Amino acid sequence: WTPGKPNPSICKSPLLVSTPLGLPRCLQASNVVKRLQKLEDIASLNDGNRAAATPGYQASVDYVKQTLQKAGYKVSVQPFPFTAYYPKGPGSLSATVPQPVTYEWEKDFTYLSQTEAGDVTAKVVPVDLSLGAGNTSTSGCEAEDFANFPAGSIALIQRGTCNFEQKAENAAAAGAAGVIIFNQGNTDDRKGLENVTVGESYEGGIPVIFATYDNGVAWSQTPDLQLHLVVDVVRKKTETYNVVAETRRGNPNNVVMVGAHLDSVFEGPGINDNGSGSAAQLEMAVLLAKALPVNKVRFAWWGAAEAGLVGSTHYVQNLAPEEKKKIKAYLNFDMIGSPNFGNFIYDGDGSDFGLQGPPGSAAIERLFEAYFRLRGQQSEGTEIDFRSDYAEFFNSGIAFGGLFTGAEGLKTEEQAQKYGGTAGKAYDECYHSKCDGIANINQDALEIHSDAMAFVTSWLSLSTKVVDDEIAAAGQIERWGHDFIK
Ligand code: NA
Ligand SMILES: [Zn+2]
Ligand SMILES: [Zn+2]
Ligand SMILES: [Zn+2]
């Protein structure tokens, strides 16, 4: 294996590692890479993944817990029940009456993530539609929408206003056999397919699929229409875990919290996504055992993020109000080793994309911006509309920030000039795939972003004054993780 050099002598000074000048120098990329190799090995021993409710995830939990305990931490493994969702094969959709049509998988229609399986054929009944440009559909949002609905029918429901889960559960309570949700069509951009979910909490029991706007319109204009609908999936009630630890030292009423989800997708080992955030954060926690922070630092490794941020969301929701209020800031680290990386910082002040985090998120962003500038490196903004485990912290008004090296987006010519790599190719062409292994890590990306992680965590562990100032001066959700919830 490739050893790094021994840590410079400043790394045993409890003073120097308590500062944003010492902590990053002590966080060596070579040491993070060895933790990434261990997670790669854990994946190889457990069918090639570290997904929620697998032995690969359990062995990941064991490794994080053991490492933390070796550093003196008391570790809290926090279990929670969790309904897993497994897509088995492609879906089927065809009209039988008044004429036979076969519709095209992943062009005409697609699954709602977290749907139940099903094989049904029934009359299709449109429910409270509002077609046409500029509409503000509330189709299926209210129980009264279904006063007309004849049980056993397939509900044809238009996207709009409320969550897909709400639409589908209302349809179920009215005795629908299945649900077809079609894109709203209120603008010419909302007429295709989308990545959409009915959520891990879905209790409707019937299958739910998504379709194009012009399909839903045509089906709504077909009297006596019957569709043959097949969804090939499985859902199972299981258990997974978050791993939480915090420093003994530090003010427990002004907690700086850092998080990184520990699960992979089922399709691969998840080494960049998100072994990289998990491993870098673990190395930092080990170093911070020696520090003398002013503010307590809490570390979290989240379960089941790939199922829609289930672990992180559950942790925040379960805090008593007095406990929630002790968390001054949350820092999220999800994918920081992308092979074709850019240097992306969460756009906390909304300067790039128009969405602002809770007060104090702008100051956290400015600290990340400062570190990259300090190092002679470029950086730029990335979106913060509830795509990662900061989402419930965001929803709760807690200041947050984070770093990102890029996923399925394509690198521009300008970004290639700023960061190197290849313009025209994804930041991580192996995102959510089998090839997201140890070989998929860019160690340059991983080093600068771990250093930047250490810098801002250290800073806030000494003083949250920049967050506190923005909080004093200050005195909808379409996405939740990978998919849209409405
Ligand atoms: Na309605
Ligand atoms: Zn991730
Ligand atoms: Zn992911
Ligand atoms: Zn910004």
Author numbering: 36 to 510, 526 to 536
Per the authors:
Here we investigated the aminopeptidase, P. aeruginosa aminopeptidase (PaAP) from P. aeruginosa, which is highly abundant in the biofilm matrix. We confirmed that post-translational processing was required for activation and PaAP is a promiscuous aminopeptidase acting on unstructured regions of peptides and proteins.
We determined the elegant regulatory mechanism whereby the C-terminal propeptide region of PaAP binds in a groove between the protease and protease-associated (PA) domain, blocking access to the active site pocket. The structure of PaAP reveals the C-terminus binds in a groove between the PA and peptidase domains, which blocks access to the active site and locks these two domains into a closed conformation. The C-terminus is a propeptide sequence that binds between the PA and peptidase domains, inducing a closed inactive conformation where the active site is occluded. Although PaAP shows substantially increased activity after C-terminal tail removal, full-length protein is catalytic active, with lower kcat. Productive substrate binding to the closed conformation is unlikely given the active site and metal occlusion when C-terminal tail occupies the active site and inhibits PaAP.
